[PDB]
Design a binder for these strands. Structure first.
Ligand SMILES: [K+]
Ligand SMILES: [K+]
Ligand SMILES: [K+]
Ligand SMILES: [K+]
Ligand SMILES: [K+]
Ligand SMILES: [K+]
Ligand SMILES: [K+]
Ligand SMILES: [K+]
Ligand SMILES: [Mg+2]
Ligand SMILES: [Mg+2]
Ligand SMILES: [Mg+2]
Ligand SMILES: [Mg+2]
Ligand SMILES: [Mg+2]
Ligand SMILES: [Mg+2]
Ligand SMILES: [Mg+2]
Ligand SMILES: [Mg+2]
Ligand SMILES: [Mg+2]
Ligand SMILES: [Mg+2]
Ligand SMILES: [Mg+2]
Ligand SMILES: [Mg+2]
Ligand SMILES: [Mg+2]
Ligand SMILES: [Mg+2]
Ligand SMILES: [Mg+2]
Ligand SMILES: [Zn+2]
Lengths: 74, 91, 102, 211, 94, 136, 141, 55
RNA sequence: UUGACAGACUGAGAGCUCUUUCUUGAUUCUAUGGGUGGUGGUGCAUGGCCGUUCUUAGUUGGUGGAGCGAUUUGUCUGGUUAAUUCCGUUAACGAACGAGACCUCAGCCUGCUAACUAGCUAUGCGGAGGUAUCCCUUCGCGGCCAGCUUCUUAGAGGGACUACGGCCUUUUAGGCCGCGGAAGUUUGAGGCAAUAACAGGUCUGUGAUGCCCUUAGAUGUUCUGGGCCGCACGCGCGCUACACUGAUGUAUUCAACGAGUUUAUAGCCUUGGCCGACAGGCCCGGGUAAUCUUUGAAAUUUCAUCGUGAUGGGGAUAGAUCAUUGCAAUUGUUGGUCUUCAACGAGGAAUUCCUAGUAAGCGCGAGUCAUCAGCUCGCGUUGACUACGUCCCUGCCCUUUGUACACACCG
């Protein structure tokens, strides 16, 4: 199966919380943003976190997501 | 162990002159690499010195390493009749 | 007073080997010399497979031991004195330098 | 004039033999390790130890003797191989030094529990992320047993073990047998690389603070 | 023979010659005992009385014309032929 | 039309026939008594096996001009059965290859290569090309 | 300026390279006509890129193919893949993209392996058995 | 013993002519690349020699 | 106190010992303590190492909650995952190991860097063929000032993240299918791998080790020879077969992982030439290596002979004889030639491994190696059937439940 681990989930949540302004819905742009604003030891981990962040952004566009606190939403 | 006087003199001279001496654990080796004397005679003479504390012995990877001490230096000087000024090259 | 100087570099550390190659290349370039290479030979992989157990009991498990040797070739069209001066630069441990003619 | 394979294998064998010889000779003097550097017509051997005074001896007599014996045994050309003695930085972060210290304490009659706890505390206060000490053998009875002391972080699987973990094993020849001591120290990330690996843990992600 | 015999086979042949010479007329030569199991029988050795070591004892033989070009080991068996007794415990039910 | 443009089997047959018709070959007296290699169990079935082997070898030298007796032994070798033991590669007879090479050199089809082995001569190239063309 | 392309097909360890340039429409492998490729049974696989497109499309290009590695079947598969890729590249770089797309589509509709290399490779064997998965026979008594 | 007898047996080949350079045992000697080390000693000293386990 | 000529003794040019008597000089001999060595016992005294429990997902603190306490919660009803992986529920909150991450190999890059120890392209020359000048096809050699890096090598990077579309699922975690894509089982295969344990193996790997035994007529060491292989019998892992989907004899031509010298006349891998039927021998030489062996396999493909006959299947057994290694080949070391031509006609109860470049067939390199591979570790070549489900058998993980078990049901 493909279940994101606690590390990926936490990293994506924190990245979205801290840099929601620059986030986009495109995986490549999100991964570039992650490379810019974070230190990820592994490229595979970076891609996984970027994909999960894109998914979380897609959900946020629909509406509130539990576990993520956005200043503008609040 | 029976050792010829010339062989003993050569071993003592080399030991005093160099301050250290190694030997592979090969009893049947015809000649010591650094001394013309047989390896067995060299090893047994060094063991005799170590028994009475004239030398410090170390063993590792099938090899003997012998380092002269102060008592060994005094004994070698007295036995070789060398002047007190002459000392092993190590110092 | 121009000769094809052959430089052979051998090491177990790819990073150190590549850094030394780059330093030699930049040193040669700074002198307006002609540099050919580095030519990277196929990696030599010394392999030893030995049984893990020190005795004959248990499932026969084996340890695959590999020692990789990396070789590089650099050719310079210059004189012995200048190539010697270039090679005089500091070289980290684990890298073996050999300089010859042809 | 030998092939590269044999040359490199011989270099490794020489390094291992020199390491073993130095350990055997400087057991009591303290021997953190050895490093071999090869330069044109010159080879340097650096002995990392906690007590360089003993290694050098009076006026370098012991180190000169070691250099001479090493050269004679390893066929090195006269005045071509030379030995240096160097202090070990943060000796508490070296398992070999800590293992030797524990061996000395146990041989001195000190209680195993007290010695292991002292070693653990010294390692932790020296800046180690975590540490573990294992003492195995006949302790207090004819039946052998194992004593484990642990404190702090520790990893045991994956590649990061090879760089973040520094481990040592030693034997103590007691009156009634042999006591095996294992020391395992987990280092901490060091950007400079002097005191720890210059690489972060694979599963460590840091997010820069937004402006 | 091309590679050449060492000193021991030559000594054995000389001893056999001496025994044959000292043998009284019309009588067999004395026993010559040896460990050389790899010795090759040559025609000159015909009629000699040889004890061949088999690892425990010197088996006695007399050299015959038909045994030339053979090893002395071939006529001094080093093992006792096997005569089988009843199987012991653990021979079956494996 | 050259050798490369014709089937190897047909060219081998045609060149063996041409070599036999030429009459310059001097078959050794033992051609009817020896196997083609220690790995074989029986002698070649075809009486013209010597001419066929000569034609095949000549084609091989025409294609590559650096082959030797050992190379031909390897080329014409194969698996050897060892009864109850597994099979392994085995070399073929070297005397046959040496004699065939000597005969071809005598006929001037090949010559010694400066780097070692044998090389096809211009006359050999011409003869092989004509045989290939006439195959049709 | 010479008008040519070079495209490689792969199958296991077999590598084939097709050099395709302007010409009268000949096709040769290692200097031998493609019609004589061995084994004779695999001539259909060898010619498939040719049977699908027709000889007229090849009538204006000379193709020289050099192969190495692998085995008898792998070399032929690499040969056909290299032929297809070389023709597609030549049409792309000297012929209208419309015709290039048409030939690519017809080739892919028949077989995708004609342009995409098969990634299968031999699995390393593990100790405790003769094969990658096969283990030594187990006995309990 | 007598010089011509004591240790007079040739030792130019075979297991008896080779021993581990570390422990001196004559069994399981790894002669590849000139290591001349028994398997146990080599497994103990592989890291120091420079042999790494990748698979 | 050592050594030794000759004779005897001895398996023996071991002065081992005796006869005969020469040489050497405090190095030894004798006795008492103390050592030393031992593949000598003890793995049920131990260290280290390895195997197994156990390939599964499991394991444990701090502060809180419950209980008088052993203990318990955290570590869970449910959904989901390969996963104690996550989503959530929640007297638990925060954490630390294991898992994952990680590292190695393979799979894609016509994009970057660089290749006379790798190649391609075109040109110049030359050979052969075709109309023989010019033109076309195919080969051989040079261009460090012909160009280039597609093919080969190896460094840096890119690339896959279920990214995108449709359904199901709690607006979650996620799952199935699908286009595209080199790759959509964690992309494939490995390395590493927690707590706690076994009286599991190893004292015969170690100058690792306690205790016990022996220590000069030795359980030390060495030499000679034999044995470890001995053959009414039972068992395990395997090799060769029972044949025509084949054997034999031609012709034909496609790999990869690797390994290689003391140069002495020469030692390791060996090219080429000559001799020979083969086995092998001799002579020039190359390679300390992408430079030379390496121009480097078989199964397979093709054409003939064989024709259902234990037959040209099968190659056990045995005779004669010839070479190579080795100081030594007999109890055949191994390798050749001819000859002999056993069981075996597909195998009972039982029982092993295996889900894709996998099983199976085919061969090749390395370890052992003076000479021996039917073995082990790797490599590639041709290349499938079936399933993609279950707990029926054998076991494993969690929960509930019973216990008179705790040496724990082999109770
Ligand atoms: K143990
Ligand atoms: K608690
Ligand atoms: K013991
Ligand atoms: K051993
Ligand atoms: K079940
Ligand atoms: K479970
Ligand atoms: K009940
Ligand atoms: K209970
Ligand atoms: Mg971990
Ligand atoms: Mg893991
Ligand atoms: Mg013994
Ligand atoms: Mg045990
Ligand atoms: Mg509590
Ligand atoms: Mg609990
Ligand atoms: Mg390229
Ligand atoms: Mg036990
Ligand atoms: Mg046995
Ligand atoms: Mg087995
Ligand atoms: Mg080939
Ligand atoms: Mg028959
Ligand atoms: Mg047959
Ligand atoms: Mg089973
Ligand atoms: Mg074996
Ligand atoms: Zn060893």
């Amino acid at each position: 199966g493909r279940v994101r681990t606690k590390t990926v989930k936490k990293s994506s949540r924190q990245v979205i919380e801290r840099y929601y302004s620059k986030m986009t819905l495109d995986f490549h742009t999100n991964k570039k943003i992650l490379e810019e604003v974070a230190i990820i030891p592994s490229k595979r981990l970076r891609n996984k976190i970027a994909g999960f962040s894109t998914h979380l952004m897609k959900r946020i566009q629909k509406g509130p997501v539990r576990g993520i606190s956005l200043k503008l939403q609040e | 162990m029976i050792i010829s006087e010339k062989n003993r003199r050569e071993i003592s001279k080399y030991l005093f002159q160099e301050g250290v001496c190694y030997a592979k654990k090969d009893y049947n080796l015809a000649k010591h690499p650094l001394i013309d004397v047989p390896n067995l005679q060299v090893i047994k003479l060094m063991q005799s010195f170590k028994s009475k504390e004239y030398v410090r012995e170390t063993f590792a990877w099938m090899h003997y390493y012998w380092y002269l001490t102060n008592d060994g230096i005094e004994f070698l000087r007295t036995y070789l009749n060398l002047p007190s000024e002459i000392v092993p090259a190590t110092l | 007073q121009i000769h094809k100087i052959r430089i052979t570099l051998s090491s177990k550390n790819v990073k150190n080997l590549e850094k030394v190659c780059a330093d030699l290349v930049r040193g040669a370039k700074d002198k307006r010399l002609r540099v050919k290479g580095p030519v990277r030979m196929p990696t030599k992989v010394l392999n030893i497979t030995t049984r893990k157990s020190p005795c004959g009991e248990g499932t026969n498990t084996w340890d695959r031991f590999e020692l990789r040797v990396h070789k590089r070739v650099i050719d310079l069209f210059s004189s012995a004195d200048v190539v010697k001066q270039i090679t005089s630069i500091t070289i980290e441990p684990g890298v073996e330098v050999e300089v010859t003619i042809a | 004039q030998i092939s590269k394979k044999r040359k490199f294998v011989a270099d490794g064998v020489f390094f291992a033999e020199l390491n073993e010889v130095l350990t055997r000779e400087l057991a009591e003097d303290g021997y953190s390790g050895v490093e071999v550097r090869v330069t044109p017509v010159r080879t340097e051997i650096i002995i990392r130890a906690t007590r360089t005074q003993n290694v050098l001896g009076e006026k370098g007599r012991r180190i000169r003797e070691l250099t001479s014996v090493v050269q004679k045994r390893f066929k090195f050309k006269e005045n071509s191989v030379e030995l240096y003695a160097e202090k070990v930085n943060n000796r508490g972060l070296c398992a070999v030094a800590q293992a030797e210290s524990l061996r000395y304490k146990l041989l001195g009659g000190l209680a195993v529990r007290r010695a292991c706890y002292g070693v653990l505390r010294f390692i932790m206060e020296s800046g180690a992320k975590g540490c573990e000490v294992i003492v195995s053998g006949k302790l207090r009875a004819q039946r052998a047993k194992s004593m484990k002391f642990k404190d702090g972080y520790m990893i045991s699987s994956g590649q990061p073990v090879k760089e973040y973990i520094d481990s040592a094993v030693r034997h103590i020849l007691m009156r009634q047998g042999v006591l095996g001591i294992k020391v395992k120290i987990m280092l901490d990330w060091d950007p400079k690389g002097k005191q720890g690996p210059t690489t972060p843990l694979p599963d460590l992600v840091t997010i820069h603070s937004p402006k | 023979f091309q590679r050449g015999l060492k000193r021991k086979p030559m000594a054995l042949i000389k001893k056999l010659r001496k025994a044959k010479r000292e043998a009284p007329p019309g009588e067999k030569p004395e026993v010559v005992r040896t460990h050389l199991r790899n010795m090759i029988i040559v025609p000159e050795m015909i009629g000699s009385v040889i004890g061949i070591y088999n690892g425990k004892t010197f088996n006695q033989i007399e050299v015959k014309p038909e045994m030339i070009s053979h090893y002395l080991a071939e006529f001094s068996i080093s093992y006792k032929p096997v005569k089988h007794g009843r199987p012991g415990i653990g021979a079956t039910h494996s | 039309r050259t050798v490369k443009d014709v089937s190897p089997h047909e060219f081998v047959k045609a060149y063996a026939a041409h070599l036999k018709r030429s009459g310059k070959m001097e078959l050794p007296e033992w051609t009817d008594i020896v196997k083609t290699g220690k790995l074989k169990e029986l002698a070649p079935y075809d009486p013209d096996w010597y001419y066929i082997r000569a034609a095949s070898m000549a084609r091989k030298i025409y294609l590559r001009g650096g082959l030797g007796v050992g190379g031909f032994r390897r080329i014409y070798g194969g698996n050897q059965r060892n009864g109850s033991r597994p099979r392994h590669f085995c070399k073929s007879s070297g005397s046959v290859a040496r004699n065939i090479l000597q005969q071809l050199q005598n006929m001037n089809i090949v010559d010694f290569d400066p780097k070692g082995g044998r090389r096809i001569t211009s006359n050999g190239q011409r003869d092989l090309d004509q045989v290939a063309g006439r195959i049709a | 300026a010479v008008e040519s392309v070079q495209c490689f097909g792969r199958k296991k360890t077999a590598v084939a390279v097709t050099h395709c340039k302007r010409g009268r429409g000949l096709i040769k492998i290692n200097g031998v006509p493609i019609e004589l490729v061995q084994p004779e049974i695999l001539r259909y696989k060898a010619f498939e890129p040719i049977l699908l497109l027709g000889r007229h499309r090849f009538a204006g290009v000379d193709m020289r193919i050099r192969v190495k590695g692998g085995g008898h079947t792998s070399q032929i598969y690499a040969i056909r893949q290299s032929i297809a890729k070389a023709l597609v590249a030549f049409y792309q770089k000297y012929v209208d993209e419309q015709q290039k797309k048409e030939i690519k589509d017809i080739l892919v509709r028949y077989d995708r392996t004609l342009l995409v290399a098969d990634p299968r490779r031999c699995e390393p064997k593990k100790f405790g058995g003769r094969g990658a998965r096969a283990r030594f026979q187990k006995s309990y008594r | 013993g007598h010089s011509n007898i004591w240790n007079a047996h040739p030792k130019n080949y075979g297991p008896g002519s080779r021993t581990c350079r570390v422990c001196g045992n004559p069994h399981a000697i790894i002669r590849k690349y000139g290591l001349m080390c028994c398997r146990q000693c080599f497994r103990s000293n592989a890291k120091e020699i420079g042999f790494i386990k990748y698979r």
